[PDB]
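Supplementary material to the annual report.
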Amino acid sequence: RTRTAYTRAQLLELEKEFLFNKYISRPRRVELAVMLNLTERHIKIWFQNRRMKWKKEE
DNA sequence: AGAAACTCATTAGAG
DNA sequence: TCTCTAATGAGTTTC
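Predicted assembly:
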């Protein structure tokens, strides 16, 4: 692949969903993919990297 | 069984 | 140059 560049609007939403959910269920993933217009792959990857970053933060 | 989604560890694209 | 983080690979869970 290349390298997606999330807009500031898209990150704001992904971080909100992250505070409420560290693991996202598929219903919510598709709901967020449709809403922000990203693929389910992008969201699934973002959460995987977001969690690895969260455990290393502290 | 097979497909999807995890973790770890790493590579490499861009502010 | 330096730092953050998207994407991929090997190997493991989960249903």
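The CA atoms of residues 47 and 56 of chain A lie 14 Å apart.
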